[PDB]
Swiss-Prot record, chains A, B, C, D, E, F:
Belongs to the bacterial microcompartments protein family. CsoS1 subfamily. Its main location: other. This is Major carboxysome shell protein CsoS1A. Disruption phenotype: Does not grow in ambient air, has a wild-type growth rate in 5% CO(2), called a high-CO(2) requiring phenotype, hcr. Fewer carboxysomes are present, RuBisCO is found to be soluble rather than in the carboxysome. Required for growth in ambient air. The major shell protein of the carboxysome, a polyhedral inclusion where RuBisCO (ribulose bisphosphate carboxylase, ccbL-ccbS) is sequestered. Assembles into hexamers which make sheets that form the facets of the polyhedral carboxysome. The shell probably limits the diffusion of CO(2) into and out of the carboxysome. Molecular modeling shows the central pore of this protein is selectively permeable to anions such as HCO(3) rather than CO(2) or O(2). There are estimated to be 2970 CsoS1A/CsoS1C proteins per carboxysome (the proteins differ by only 1 residue). InterPro entries: Bact_microcomp_CS, BMC_dom, BMC_shell, CcmK-like_sf, CcmK/CsoS1_BMC. PROSITE patterns: BMC_1, BMC_2. GO terms for cellular component: carboxysome. The keyword Zinc-finger does not apply.
Length: 92, 92, 92, 92, 92, 92
């Protein structure tokens, strides 16, 4: 499944809550957590479209009330193949 | 094609949306995504002039409403050869 | 014990106080301290659920009055196995 | 030619426009682009005094209207030899 | 002596003044200087409890009036052994 | 000569002007330029006490009017030997 779900937070703690809520909500794989600069943190998941819709919704609801909270919650159901080149495949 | 299109966003999520909209809009290659500091993120595309005009317009429209949104959308149709030395050739 | 406790602070000094108060409060292991960007710092502990509840409560109370203070104090008693992939195992 | 021209911007996009306008305006070499922190970006050029005067003027005019815009535009016609030790020789 | 003294500043210049005043004030060892992000800088000293009390007091008084000044001044007389794992042993 | 002169600026451009004015003003050696985070930049010089007094005064006057300007200008005529461990010896 190649849909992409992304949540961006202010700080790491809400990003970890978002990642947990996303991965518990539907069958998605956590492919990255990126320290963006300035305090933004982004967590990325992949899966089938329906799973990513459910996951991103659950992660937004969950992280909104944690720490400095939620910046963005967004889905792209099929990114262009060019965009794959900037997406992490595995987290570290 | 050596035209250059660039979009800068506040945060990574709108930058990924910009990259997707740009690369779907016209025949352009995504050459980099740069974490600038402070939370700015910049995505860079190359292509023929007409393709880059279409791409940057589509990416600006798309990322404006995502997360903390859009900072800059700019085209340079032929950068000086000196400028090539600071442009990424391939993303990571 | 796989419960997760996290405290995020503005600056390193309150994060070190949080880590000390957490690890003195109950049997938890300090698994990471992450410089997030922008001045956020996050400290992470693992342990049994009861121990992590006590630890995070003690760390929040303690670091609130140090430096620029407390951003987030949060517990996840059982993270999804996917989330383990973004959690540090050992600090540096 | 050892004169030094420097432009600092808020974000990368105006810095790339400054670099293009500088290098098109007169015979100068782009020696660096530095991500400073906080979102500042600095672009550095070397050349003969007259060329650097023209270049920095053209780059300031050009980048002022791009993205978050212009912070500094400055020339040093002959830096002390000590200062050479902190100036990049080649960009990456 | 295992007491810990810490001062956090806005910028490096007040941190260097804090480190000098701390190390002149009592027998303490400067174990680290950490660039935290966002402009915070933290300097860490170790020593016997009395020495660290004197040092941190002297460093706070001294750096308060330098640059963007003082964020935090804090002592932990005996950190938990877990906390040793995030404390630098030697500066770089 | 082991006196230490330091100037901290908002952005790199005023730091380079400070370094030039300092090194032209008296016999001092530029030992570092540090990107601190958040946009702070610090430049460090060493020399005899009189030379460092003259240099730091000249650098403060010069960089105040460049870009986002001056944060701190400070001299320590003899740092504690402990502080040498956090001072750069050579710039990069």
């Amino acid at each position: 499944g190649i849909a992409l779900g992304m949540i961006e937070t202010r700080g790491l703690v809400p990003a970890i809550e978002a990642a947990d809520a996303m991965t518990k909500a539907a069958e998605v794989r956590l492919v990255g957590r990126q320290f963006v600069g300035g305090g933004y943190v982004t967590v990325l998941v992949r899966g089938e479209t329906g799973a990513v819709n459910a996951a991103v919704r659950a992660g937004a609801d969950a992280c909104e009330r944690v720490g400095d909270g939620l910046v963005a919650a967004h889905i792209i159901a099929r990114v262009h193949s060019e965009v794959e080149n900037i997406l992490p495949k595995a987290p570290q």
